[PDB]
């Protein structure tokens, strides 16, 4: 099974993520299970950083 990304971290891909990366300087991930989105900036998502 694939585990949720920890709080303050975001999945590297919108679907079928392979690694979890920390939110960069100046960003913050409130919720766990954050994931990046290709649309818009590559460092943010609907719940991402």
């Amino acid at each position: 099974q694939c585990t949720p990304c920890a709080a303050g971290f975001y999945a590297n891909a919108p679907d079928s993520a392979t690694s979890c990366r920390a939110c960069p300087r100046g960003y913050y991930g409130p919720y766990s299970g954050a994931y990046a989105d290709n649309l818009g900036d590559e460092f943010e998502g609907p719940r991402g950083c």
């Binding site: 585990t3 920890a6 971290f9 920390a22």
Partner: peptide, 25 residues
């Protein structure tokens, strides 16, 4: 004969990574 028991759950998940003008004449 009775059926065998169920296997023990896997170990805990891993943690997370770290961080002056001149005077007049």
């Amino acid at each position: 004969p009775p059926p065998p028991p169920p296997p023990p759950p896997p170990p805990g998940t891993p943690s997370t990574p770290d961080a002056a003008p001149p005077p007049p004449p």
